[PDB]
């Protein structure tokens, strides 16, 4: 039923070749790294393989972050895997192609990650911002020290069971109300200016009618309905499709509704 | 099954087959020999 | 286009003696801690963390507008500094 | 401006080679130089 | 323009995974060799490094005469790489699957491959048939040996430019015509029990207009206008005109090969 | 049922009948093997069918479908000779 669409969610593999950038200094030629992202995870949290791999070519003082970049735009690791390919390269050729740097990190464009505790530190920022907009912060701020650590490694382990026992918790709302209060979502344009568009919005209408992804694309986004594709999780949902439903089913783990407006295809 | 629902299984199926399925194998094979 | 921002303190940190400030929409939160960390006379090395809602803290690139339009309150942005983290 | 049949083939050879060829020469060709 | 069309559909590649069929008797396991396998070529005619690699692992007593398989289905030769892709795997994640035989062969399936000389002569029987409906074979008779020699060469070496400088004269017709006499077409079906179907069919009518490719299926096989008709792993509209069908979407052998089958979910 | 009139172009021996009524579904392989068989002709020896005078039909091809692009006066004729007659 509707657990098949979070299994299908959660376990969304992209096909990625990590090449090595042409100028980085090597001991001896550098093998391409072929690799399953996880869609719904972060880069700098799945790509040790990755580390360690090219990392065997280089000197110990030739070694720094290691930092990706895609045609020449630097991968932000806060943003989602799957978010940055469907953004970024969807409509490329598989599988995608990632450039593997080290030296000459772009400070103007990419946020450091320092360790794995940042990224764990980032992931609860989101869930505890998310929440605030569908609970007032009650449900992820009554929780047990715990519970915010099973989450984590459930992300961190690719346990889904492990991390649903949690998070459902997050998805489930008062008997009397039809939703949360408002619906996390953000809208990514690479076409835009601002990074991306996060307003407030109902998933219940006045009269009770529950508000689709159409009616939410035409308040906060009336320009994406005119040519453009509306991509969440690599797929292209329906406009019809109850918004409320969606926030269940299609979240990341952040519990974030990550909505990018692409052009379709051109050949 | 209301019919957004079944679009969106279909999409996340079809998704997996192309992106997933095609290059699973392949790749298994190449991390061995590396 | 400017927006109202609140801001207070949470110990032991040095106190802003301007806390009412009116701030630009495009503004990020780092541009806003570095903003802060001058008055406060605090290198760049040292952390400033910054919450919303006393509850969450949103990432350095994150705009101030769009944390006001959401998390707003009486025609102001209330935001925390804190030289460690508060909350989690 | 080209018929809109001629047009369609065009886009659906370019759609076909992107899908099929373009999706797995480079991996086959990295693969058979560790063979 | 056109000739970006010729192009794209002589290049035109399917990535394929051969596997060693597991009862063959070898002195050590064998890996998968992957190979992007050209759409407008013969099996017998591209894979001889795949036969190189499965015969490593084999003594000289063990190995025959190669045949391959896809899903059960012996895999005919003699029909283009393109042509069987669309027919059998097209519905299939990629890689094309195709298992690598030696012992067994299937005599009653398969035409026996025993030499490249035996796909040059089918590969020229297929051109010279495909002359004979297009122009009661006038043009292609009146080619110097050389001529032949060039169109099999720039096939069997991916020469484009080789093999369209002669080619080009197999495409023309009487200025006072608007195209062939008949079109050189087989279509195939999964679920019939002929081969193909190959009939005869003009590319213009009584008044003087092109027969589109609908035409051509509603005369021949009305039982697919639910079915796909693919022709070199596209989907060509119905409106398609079959004289410039023939003239850019046919193979080297000069003949189109046209695929039906279900569509697919 | 397909009628097939069979001609020999030499240096060929000749067939006693030429006449003959095939199946729509029998390939030029089995005609090919069929007369051999008459022409006292082992399997190492070649044997050429032609149709129109002209081109060697594959040896997968059917019969019937032959006689429907190239059959004239009721029946489909085939030239048979142990050389390449025509190119
Ligand atoms: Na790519
Ligand atoms: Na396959």
Redesign the interface.
């Given at each position: 039923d509707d657990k098949d669409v979070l299994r299908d969610v959660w376990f969304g593999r992209i096909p990625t070749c990590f090449t090595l950038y042409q100028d980085e200094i090597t001991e001896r030629e550098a093998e391409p790294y072929y690799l399953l992202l996880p869609r719904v995870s972060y880069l700098t949290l799945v790509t040790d393989k990755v580390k360690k791999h090219f990392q065997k070519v280089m000197r110990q003082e030739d070694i720094s972050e290691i930092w990706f970049e895609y045609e020449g735009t630097p991968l932000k690791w806060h943003y989602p895997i799957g978010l940055l390919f469907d953004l970024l390269a969807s409509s490329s050729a598989l599988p995608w192609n990632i450039t593997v740097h080290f030296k000459s990190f772009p400070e103007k464009d990419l946020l450091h990650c320092p360790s794995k505790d940042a990224i764990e530190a980032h992931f609860m920022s989101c869930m505890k911002e998310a929440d605030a907009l569908k609970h007032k912060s009650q449900v992820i701020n009554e929780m047990q020290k715990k519970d915010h650590k099973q989450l984590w490694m459930g992300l961190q382990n690719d346990r889904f069971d492990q991390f649903w026992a949690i998070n459902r918790k997050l998805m489930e709302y008062p008997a009397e109300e039809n939703g949360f209060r408002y619906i996390p979502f953000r809208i990514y344009q690479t076409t835009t200016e601002r990074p991306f568009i996060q307003k407030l919005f109902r998933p219940v209408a006045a009269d009770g009618q529950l508000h689709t992804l159409g009616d939410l694309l035409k308040e906060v986004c009336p320009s994406a309905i005119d040519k453009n594709q509306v991509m969440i999780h690599g797929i292209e949902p329906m406009l019809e499709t109850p918004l409320q439903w969606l926030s269940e089913h299609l979240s990341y783990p952040d519990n974030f509704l990550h909505i990018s407006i692409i052009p379709q295809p051109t050949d | 099954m209301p019919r957004w629902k079944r679009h969106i299984s279909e999409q996340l199926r079809r998704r997996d087959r192309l992106q997933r399925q095609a290059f699973e194998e392949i790749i298994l094979q190449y991390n061995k020999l590396l | 286009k400017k927006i109202d921002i609140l801001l207070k303190a949470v110990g032991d940190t040095p106190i802003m003696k301007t806390k009412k400030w009116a701030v630009e929409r495009?503004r990020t939160i780092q541009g806003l801690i570095d903003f802060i960390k001058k008055f406060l006379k605090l290198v760049a090395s040292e952390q400033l963390f910054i919450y919303?809602?006393q509850?969450?803290?949103?990432?350095?690139?994150?705009?101030v507008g769009?944390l006001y339009?959401?998390?707003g309150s009486d025609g102001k942005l209330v935001l925390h500094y804190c030289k460690s983290?508060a909350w989690?």
């Open positions: - | - | 495009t919303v809602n509850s969450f803290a949103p990432s350095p690139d994150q705009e769009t339009e959401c998390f983290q989690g």
